């Protein structure tokens, strides 16, 4: 019930890509690989195990992360965060790459842990439909 190249798991189709893209480009690319396509959404431990296996069999890098579809929607650098002294945050000097509001799977943690990483990174990914 899935296109050739894709793998089926509990009603959905999954496909890993060894392409190096930013989170934005990856998400967009997925929306184009199939109707209703998106970066993978890991909603249960079982699906996490299925995806980890899919990644281990089609990525193998020992480096770089694998994008998943969970990230901070807004464009803020920090949310509802106030200085410990009690004052509001107005002035800020974040390095864009230090604002790790995207998530990726990584080899060291068996591709089953979501690691906070910079969205502008260029990594492989997994699409889901």
């Amino acid at each position: 019930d899935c296109p050739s190249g894709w793998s089926s798991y509990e009603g959905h189709c999954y496909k890993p890509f060894k392409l190096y893209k930013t989170w934005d480009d990856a998400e967009r690319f997925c929306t184009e690989q199939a109707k209703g396509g998106h970066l993978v959404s890991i909603e249960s431990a079982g699906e996490a195990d299925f995806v980890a296996q899919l990644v281990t069999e089609n990525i193998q890098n020992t480096k770089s992360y694998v994008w998943i579809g969970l990230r901070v929607q807004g464009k803020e650098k920090q949310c509802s965060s106030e200085w410990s002294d009690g004052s509001s945050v107005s002035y800020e000097n974040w390095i864009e790459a230090e604002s790790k509001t995207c998530l990726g799977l990584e080899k060291e943690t068996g591709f089953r842990k979501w690691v906070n990483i910079y969205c502008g990174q260029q990594n492989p990914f997994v699409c889901e439909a």
Binding site: E43, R71, Q73, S81, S84, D85, N93, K100
Partner: protein, 123 residues
Amino acid sequence: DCPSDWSSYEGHCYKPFSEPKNWADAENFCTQQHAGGHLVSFQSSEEADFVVKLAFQTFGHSIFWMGLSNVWNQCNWQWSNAAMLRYKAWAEESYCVYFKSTNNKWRSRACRMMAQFVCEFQA
């Protein structure tokens, strides 16, 4: 005139410590070094300029906690396919802000990890 072990700037007192602590411990320790004390807060680029220098002159190149914690915990995290966020598998529970003594750029580090720090209070 800030305590002998501190440094003054714009009516405030600042002091960098070498004892390594995670974010929470650092902040609590600061509230115990003098009344109204907390982890250093950068409300302006001028203040940050002062602190970075003070920190580097004292201990040189290192990393120091700033008064910001759990920076993304209450952000609007959402799946791109709009699935509800229930199951979770975070590698780290929360991130805190710090600075590297070579410049005033803001950086993130897991709050459970260690770093040096700078306390501050209004004179």
